[PDB]
């Protein structure tokens, strides 16, 4: 899951 | 409410790239072709116009006549009166032209003349014949 | 966040609200007056803080009440109810604490737990703490399951879980204070390095990353806004969705080229019409000038009609010369209005081959995070858990993640080397039949009141079954097992005599050559104290590298590294390991993902226990007997250590409520 991502964290399609 | 900026995602377009397997690759060729089709058309007119450009070579330089600079006068030498009558035959009410031809009369004297000699130079007749052309 | 509101957040609860789980137990409170709720809430948070402040020692109901104040420390049935609910659901006194009140000399109820994965261990520890007779059956010869830590000499590297994804509200935060794990922070910096062996430059790097995230937002917009979620009856994958976006971007790149080159023609074509007009004027001029010359031949003196003639022709020639001056004027505007547009084309391509390649590495990063081909992830839901991200720097466990399951294993009845073969659950109890993985004909049977099954989803998935449920699991559960995704990702561990890479940098990409190999050794980690580099194999590649030998793999690894640091800076690796999770019979994969046509809700079905039919017909409805915990069962925290650990807590709570009853609901 996105949450796994440590390196260049996907930003797109997220609610920030 | 909207895509990210400058991404283009209309309902309509979405459907046309999904409709079948290579409906994606179809439309991207119609365009690749449209583009080449227009791109050659471009060179064609670029080619057409380059030929018409060369025929206007030299411009209108060997055809320009220097400038008659002359002081606008008030009185009507018989010469000028006749130039007039004939300008009228050829120009109708183009007072500007009639004035240019006669060389030394303002666009108004030209107008004035019209009422002044109206009877003597049958300007009614003259003008009706300008219209017969 | 801090004080008592820090604690609420660090335990993943709204500090000023009562959760649906609390409503369940305290429906007196939550359907009652505001005032009391706030008292309640406080008591809760307060207690949390206390346990949080010091998790090396158990928090008793006494210790709690002692440290409360009036008005709060005034109602003791409240306080007690709260403290007990907390303890029951593992919000306090979980993990490894010194007990004060030593253990319940005789036990109550008996539980078999399949697998000593972390979910397993966490659940056991709870149950044991709750005075239950707990035994775990591990098929492997170590605990920890998918938390595998490679050890040899001084080399230490997890082929399993490896990162703590931030302490911000992370149960692992607690566990880390309870256990000698050595957490180093991971520095975010990540250079990429295309196939050639040379860095991507900041320019590109940033322009592609930005376009990638641009393309994600996009897919999301298709999903929620445009509702693009079924395609000829099949659920739309994220993979597909990305393509459809990329195409629509490629297409617009062209629609733009077309219109800009269409302005050029519409213009270049006025120019034509004008050049024509102009060439017909040079005509009438030429010929008029002839005429006026002929008429200035007639040498004076001359009758007036002949004098008129010259003058007339003169004016007429001037008239026409004005005009062609006005057109040379016009001709001049348009002529540059072309060196205009021709100077600003729109963009040539949507993305280059060098671009689409770096863009791939960004898709590998997704495939690694979801352990799968994006062609498989659910469009609407792949990221359905994103709201529950922890905060803070991700971390590594410098002394190897295993250090944790092992810690958790202490105090516990764990039968290692024992492969469950059959689960038999019935109105009056359960028996689990297991063999011995060494000599397999040698059989075991365990009778118990309840079974907690922490079998990995890939296991639960085997066709044909590696474990048999008796009776067969109801269709609602098995469909969830099909629908759900259980992916795969591998690790390559490289041990050297010396550091030959950038010591101050922890990660660094390698961009692949094709779309197809996008995940092949796409990412490296300098994480450990010793000279170890570790590389991910992800996406489609994961599955196919399993079929290749360790050398042919370590080769491609060294290849790439040489490529990046120079053929002679990269020595023969002293020790090498390669994970193969899909092959591993006790994993059958690495962790779950929400596959296309699944939702997060399936994770909920994974967790719903099973209640046997009745023995004697017409006898009343039985207790539920078969329970499930594990990474595939926790909707809000899938695929992770804390996620599992948390589901373990959850089931142990639910099972204890079932067999020891719950005194706190009154
Ligand atoms: C390569 C990789 C990297 C990962 N990295 C991270 C990370 O960085 N951060 C993070 O938070 N998470 C990470 N994870 C995910 C995480 O490791 C898992 O979600 C978690 O470890 C699962 O624990 P579990 O108890 O749910 O299942 P498991 O640990 O798989 O436990 C299942 C247990 O059952 C045993 N078993 C299977 N069948 C039988 C049977 N027939 N009879 C008896 N026993 C059986 C297994 O051997 C095992 O001990 C990673 C996973 C992988 C594969």
Atom 38 (ligand 1) nearest CA:
C586
Three-state DSSP at C270 gives helix
The angle subtended at Cα C127 by Cα C659 and Cα C48, nearest 5°, is: 105
Distances (CA, A) of C609 to A13, C415, C627, C638, C651: 34, 24, 5, 18, 9
The C-alpha atoms of residue C310 and residue C303 are separated, in whole angstroms, by 12
Question: A touches which chains (3+ CB pairs under 8 A)?
Answer: C
Ligand 1 atom nearest the C-alpha of C140 is 47
Atom 6 (ligand 1) nearest CA:
C161
- Tell whether ligand 1 has an atom less than 6 A from the beta carbon of residue C147: yes
CB of A16 within 8 Å of a chain C CB? The answer is: no
The angle subtended at Cα C535 by Cα C529 and Cα C540, nearest 5°, is: 160
Ligand 1 atom nearest the C-alpha of C579 is 1
Q: Which of C81, C109, C137 is the last residue of a domain?
A: C109
Can you spell out the DSSP letters for C206-246?
A: HHHHHHHHHHHHHHHHHHHTS---EETTEEPBHHHHHHHHH
The C-alpha atoms of residue C367 and residue C519 are separated, in whole angstroms, by 8
Residues C516 and C594 in one domain: yes
Mutate to test the interface with C, among B38, B70, B87 (most CBs of C within 10 A): B38
Residues C529 and C648 in one domain: yes
Residues C197 and C326 in one domain: no
- Residues of chain C contacting A3 with CB distance shorter than 8 Å: 165, 369, 385-386, 388-390, 637, 640
- Omega prior to C441 cis, within 30 of 0: no
Q: Among residues C460, C476, C415, C468, which one has the least CA distance to residue C592?
A: C460
Beta bridge partners of C158: C149
The C-alpha atoms of residue C348 and residue C253 are separated, in whole angstroms, by 8
Please count the other Cβ atoms lying within 10 Å of the Cβ belonging to residue C552. Answer: 10
Distance C139 CA to ligand 1 centre (A): 13
Distance C27 CA to ligand 1 centre (A): 37
Three-state DSSP at C425 gives strand
> Domain containing C389: what range?
110-235+352-666
Q: Which method, experimentally, gave rise to this model?
A: X-ray
Residues C135 and C103 in one domain: no
Pairing label, strands C414-415, C418-426: unpaired
The total number of structural domains that make up chain C? 3
Residues C296 and C380 in one domain: no
Residues C306 and C222 in one domain: no
Residues C358 and C497 in one domain: yes
Three-state DSSP at C457 gives helix
Q: Strands across the sheet with C575-578, in order?
A: C507-509, C523-526, C532-537, C490-495, C575-578
- Nearest Cα residue in chain C from A16: C387
**In Å, what resolution does this model reach?**
3.1
Pairing label, strands C414-415, C429-436: unpaired
C163 annotated as a binding-site residue: yes
Per-residue tokens: C27 = 């429906």
Residues C507 and C396 in one domain: yes
Q: Which of C49, C84, C109 is the last residue of a domain?
A: C109
Residues C281 and C331 in one domain: yes
Residues C158 and C280 in one domain: no
- Residues of chain A contacting C389 with CB distance shorter than 8 Å: 2-3
Distance C57 CA to ligand 1 centre (A): 28
Q: Among residues C130, C162, C168, C122, which one has the least CA distance to residue C11?
A: C168
CATH for the B1-133 domain, from 1.20.58.1880, 1.20.1630.10, 2.130.10.10, 3.40.50.10260: 1.20.58.1880
Q: Among residues C598, C600, C534, which one has the least CA distance to residue C161?
A: C534
The angle subtended at Cα C544 by Cα C543 and Cα C546, nearest 5°, is: 80
Residues C85 and C125 in one domain: no
- Tell whether ligand 1 has an atom less than 6 A from the beta carbon of residue C650: no
Atom 14 (ligand 1) nearest CA:
C161
- Residues of chain B contacting C227 with CB distance shorter than 8 Å: none
Three-state DSSP at B61 gives helix
Domain ranges of chain B: 1-133
Distance C117 CA to ligand 1 centre (A): 6
- Residues of chain B contacting C217 with CB distance shorter than 8 Å: 3-4, 7
Q: Which of C69, C86, C109 is the last residue of a domain?
A: C109
The C-alpha atoms of residue C427 and residue C625 are separated, in whole angstroms, by 8
CB of B63 within 8 Å of a chain C CB? The answer is: yes
What is the maximum alpha-carbon separation in chain B? 91
The angle subtended at Cα C149 by Cα C148 and Cα C155, nearest 5°, is: 160
> If you count DSSP H runs as helices and E runs as strands, how many of each does chain C have, helices first?
19, 23
């Amino acid at each position: 899951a996105r949450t796994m991502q440590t390196a260049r964290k996907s930003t797109g399609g997220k609610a920030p | 409410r909207k895509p990210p900026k400058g991404m283009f995602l209309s309902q309509e377009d979405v459907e046309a790239v999904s409709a079948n397997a290579t409906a994606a690759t179809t439309v991207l060729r119609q365009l690749d072709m449209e583009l080449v089709s227009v791109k050659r058309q471009i060179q064609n007119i670029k080619q057409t116009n380059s030929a018409l450009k060369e025929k206007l070579d030299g411009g209108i330089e060997p055809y320009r006549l220097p400038e008659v600079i002359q002081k606008c006068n008030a009185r009507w030498t018989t010469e000028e009166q006749l130039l007039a009558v004939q300008a009228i035959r050829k120009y109708g009410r183009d007072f500007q032209a009639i004035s240019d031809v006669i060389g030394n009369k303002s666009v108004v004297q030209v107008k004035n003349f019209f009422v002044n000699y109206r009877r003597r130079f049958n300007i009614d007749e003259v003008l009706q014949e300008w219209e017969a052309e | 966040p801090s004080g008592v509101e820090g604690a609420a957040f660090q335990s993943r609860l709204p500090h000023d609200r009562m959760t649906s789980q609390e409503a369940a137990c305290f429906p007196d409170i939550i359907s009652g007056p505001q005032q009391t709720q706030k008292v309640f809430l406080f008591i809760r948070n307060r207690t949390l803080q206390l346990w949080l402040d010091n998790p090396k020692i158990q928090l008793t109901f006494e210790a709690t009440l002692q440290q409360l104040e009036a008005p709060y420390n005034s109602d003791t049935v409240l306080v007690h109810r709260v403290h007990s609910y907390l303890e029951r659901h593992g919000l306090i006194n979980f993990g490894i604490y010194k007990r004060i009140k030593p253990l319940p000399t005789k036990k109550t109820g008996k539980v078999i737990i399949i697998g000593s994965g972390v979910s397993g261990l966490a659940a056991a520890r709870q149950l044991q703490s709750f005075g239950m007779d707990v035994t775990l059956l591990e098929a492997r010869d170590r605990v920890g399951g998918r938390v595998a830590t490679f050890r040899k000499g001084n080399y230490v590297a997890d082929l399993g879980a490896m990162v703590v994804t931030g302490l911000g509200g992370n149960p692992m935060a607690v566990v880390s204070k309870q256990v000698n794990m050595e957490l180093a922070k991971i520095k975010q910096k990540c250079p990429l390095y295309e196939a050639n062996g040379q860095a991507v430059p900041k320019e590109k790097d940033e322009m592609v990353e930005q376009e990638f995230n641009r393309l994600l937002e996009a897919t999301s917009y298709l999903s929620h806004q445009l509702d693009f979620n079924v395609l000829n009856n099949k659920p739309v994958s994220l993979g597909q969705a990305l393509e459809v976006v990329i195409q629509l971007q490629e297409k617009h790149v062209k629609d733009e080229q077309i219109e800009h080159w269409k302005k050029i023609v519409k213009t270049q074509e006025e120019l034509k019409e004008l050049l024509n007009k102009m060439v017909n004027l040079k005509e009438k001029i030429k010929e008029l000038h002839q005429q006026y010359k002929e008429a200035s031949e007639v040498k004076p003196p001359r009758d007036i009609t002949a004098e008129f003639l010259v003058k007339s022709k003169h004016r007429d020639l001037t008239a026409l010369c004005k005009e062609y001056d006005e057109l040379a004027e016009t001709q001049g505007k348009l002529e540059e209005k072309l060196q205009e547009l021709e100077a600003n084309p729109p963009s040539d391509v949507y993305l280059s081959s060098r671009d689409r390649q770096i863009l791939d590495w960004h898709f590998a990063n997704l495939e690694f995070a979801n352990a799968t081909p994006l062609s498989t992830l659910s469009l609407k839901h792949w990221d359905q858990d994103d709201d529950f991200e922890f905060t803070g720097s991700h971390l590594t466990v410098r002394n190897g993640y295993s250090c944790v399951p092992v810690a958790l294993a202490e105090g516990l009845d764990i039968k290692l080397n024992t492969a469950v073969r059959q689960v038999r659950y019935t109105a009056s109890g359960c028996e689990v039949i297991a063999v011995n993985t060494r000599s397999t004909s040698q059989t075991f049977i365990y009778k118990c009141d309840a079974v907690l099954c922490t079998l990995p989803l890939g296991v639960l998935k085997q066709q044909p079954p590696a474990v048999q449920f008796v009776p067969p699991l109801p269709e609602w559960k098995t469909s969830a097992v099909q629908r759900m995704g259980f992916g795969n990702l591998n690790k390559v561990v490289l041990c050297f005599d010396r550091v030959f890479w950038d010591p101050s940098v922890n990660l660094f990409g390698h961009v692949g050559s094709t779309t197809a190999s996008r995940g092949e050794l796409f990412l490296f980690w300098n994480l450990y104290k010793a000279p170890i580099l570790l590389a991910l194999v992800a996406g489609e590649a994961a599955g196919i590298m399993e079929n290749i030998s360790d050398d042919v793999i370590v080769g491609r690894c060294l290849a790439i590294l040489k490529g990046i640091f120079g053929s002679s800076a990269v020595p023969q690796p002293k020790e090498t390991v390669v994970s193969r999770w899909r092959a591993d019979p006790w994993a059958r994969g690495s962790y779950s993902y929400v596959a296309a046509g699944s939702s997060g809700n399936d994770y909920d079905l994974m967790a719903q226990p099973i209640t046997p039919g009745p023995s004697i017909p017409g006898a009343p409805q039985p207790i539920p007997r078969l329970f499930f915990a594990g990474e595939h069962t926790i909707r809000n925290y899938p695929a992770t250590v804390h996620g599992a650990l948390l589901s373990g807590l959850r089931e142990a709570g639910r099972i204890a409520d079932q067999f020891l009853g719950a005194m706190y609901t009154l």
